[PDB]
Amino acid sequence: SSPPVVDTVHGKVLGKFVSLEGFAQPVAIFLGIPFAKPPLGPLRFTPPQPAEPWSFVKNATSYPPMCTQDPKAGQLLSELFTNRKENIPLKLSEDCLYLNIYTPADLTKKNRLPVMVWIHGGGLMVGAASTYDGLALAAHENVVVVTIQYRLGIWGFFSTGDEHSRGNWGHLDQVAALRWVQDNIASFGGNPGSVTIFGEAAGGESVSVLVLSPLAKNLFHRAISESGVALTSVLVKKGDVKPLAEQIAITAGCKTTTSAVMVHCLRQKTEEELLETTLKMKFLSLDLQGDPRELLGTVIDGMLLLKTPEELQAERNFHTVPYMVGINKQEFGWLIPMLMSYPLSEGQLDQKTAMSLLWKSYPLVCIAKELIPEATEKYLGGTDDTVKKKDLFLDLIADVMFGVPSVIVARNHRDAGAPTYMYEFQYRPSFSSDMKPKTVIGDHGDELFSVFGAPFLKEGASEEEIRLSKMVMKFWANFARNGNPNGEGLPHWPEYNQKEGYLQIGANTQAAQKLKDKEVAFWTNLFAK
Numbered sequence: 001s002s003p004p005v006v007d008t009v010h011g012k013v014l015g016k017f018v019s020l021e022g023f024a025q026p027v028a029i030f031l032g033i034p035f036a037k038p039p040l041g042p043l044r045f046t047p048p049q050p051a052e053p054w055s056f057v058k059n060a061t062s063y064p065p066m067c068t069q070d071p072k073a074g075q076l077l078s079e080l081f082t083n084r085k086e087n088i089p090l091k092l093s094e095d096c097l098y099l100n101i102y103t104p105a106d107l108t109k110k111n112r113l114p115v116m117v118w119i120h121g122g123g124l125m126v127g128a129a130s131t132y133d134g135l136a137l138a139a140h141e142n143v144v145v146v147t148i149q150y151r152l153g154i155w156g157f158f159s160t161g162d163e164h165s166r167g168n169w170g171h172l173d174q175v176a177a178l179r180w181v182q183d184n185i186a187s188f189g190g191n192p193g194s195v196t197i198f199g200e201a202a203g204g205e206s207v208s209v210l211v212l213s214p215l216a217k218n219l220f221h222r223a224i225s226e227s228g229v230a231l232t233s234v235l236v237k238k239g240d241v242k243p244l245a246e247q248i249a250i251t252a253g254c255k256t257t258t259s260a261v262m263v264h265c266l267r268q269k270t271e272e273e274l275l276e277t278t279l280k281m282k283f284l285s286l287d288l289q290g291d292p293r294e295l296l297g298t299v300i301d302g303m304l305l306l307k308t309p310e311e312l313q314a315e316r317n318f319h320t321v322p323y324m325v326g327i328n329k330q331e332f333g334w335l336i337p338m339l340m341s342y343p344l345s346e347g348q349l350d351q352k353t354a355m356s357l358l359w360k361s362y363p364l365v366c367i368a369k370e371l372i373p374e375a376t377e378k379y380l381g382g383t384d385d386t387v388k389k390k391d392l393f394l395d396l397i398a399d400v401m402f403g404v405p406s407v408i409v410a411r412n413h414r415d416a417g418a419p420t421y422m423y424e425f426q427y428r429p430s431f432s433s434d435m436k437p438k439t440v441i442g443d444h445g446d447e448l449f450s451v452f453g454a455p456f457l458k459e460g461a462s463e464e465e466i467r468l469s470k471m472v473m474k475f476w477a478n479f480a481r482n483g484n485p486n487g488e489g490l491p492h493w494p495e496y497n498q499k500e501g502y503l504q505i506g507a508n509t510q511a512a513q514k515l516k517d518k519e520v521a522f523w524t525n526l527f528a529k
């Protein structure tokens, strides 16, 4: 009747009710709650500060701006990934440190429901919380769903490699949002003692990063990485970040005399100017010319990450929470290459062209030139059919970006004594772009529709697709509840232990063993030549 009003640490918020078919209790939704001070002016390239408190009742019933980003690419990704019947257009702003809350709890009664905090993907460059409607997951599984934003691109990841601009601002924003959830979620019927972080692609990489960061201690109790981990190398910069910083500075019209001079100049630029610079840098496509070894992202900054992910894994001081790590069958099948304008159009590929392409693909796969013939031969050499070569080439890219890093992370996590689970998702959603070939199954992002209940929001899902979403949401929420996805009515999902059991999720969901085992061996041996 009366819209719901909730006390938070910094003031009161007003949300709205939305009913979902099948559920008598409306879900209370609060959109655009700030969890930090807007990072404007001198606060650019600094850690997020607490939000300033507000008087009276803040109206939390409209979607916030998305963090500044290429609007064309951001809109396109939102349209492709949204679980909503209609994509919600968003404004851009630097003032973007907001989260959205979907709580199925009757807030007039006592509730301490599991909380699931969603970290969106988009390469650390694009993306928005508001793409993901929490309504269906929250109602079907009785969990509080929180979708967060974090600074993107230059704003989120500009690093001088030193104390004048350490980097990882967007990850610090993710931490700040988690701190806010600890301090406030009980007011929305959530249990701050049961917080599950989950995310896809760059969001899954962020989750994996958080598992490795001391700054995230006591902020979550389970984790889920979907199609991205901290060994997804395209997102993690090792070695010297100064040349990139200088390139950004120069492109923005700034001198490079010192790091502090660069950062000061960049802090005087307008949002418009930094977006112009962003677009000039071409951050989500491959460089046409010159050395492939010459992207923005996560760095080893000394505050969030003290050493490389590989070193932190070997040390097992990371957070040994229950962790679910998964991939999709064909991660490089359609969506990623299409969004990147990846330079492969023909539908066939000879081996010479494959080798040159894999070198030009260095930013994505990080494969040294001397290793390229041996890698290309492994995947493509067994067949003289150039169509088949092309499909195997897409498998090559997927395995290096996603499957191999995911299994290495899951193995290290298990070996530290943490409960670990894996999956491979193999289904082609009806919600796919009708420009995607009918034969691409388990593309990057295809699991999103199941996790977020798209069959309950969008039109056209088959009986099988409806049931697949129910099953997936239930596994995810059981994992949030118990650190173990299993429950009555659901296929058995083995623990990822020394037998390396994992779940093959799709139309016929069943357990299997030793996901990507032969691929991990191949690549690990190759990279150690």
Ligand SMILES: *[C@@H]1O[C@H](CO)[C@@H](O)[C@H](O)[C@H]1NC(C)=O
Binding pocket: 059, 061, 062
């Ligand atoms: C809250 O915001 C909506 C627009 O998003 C507006 O229509 C509504 O009247 C507002 N309610 C207030 C300020 O009480």
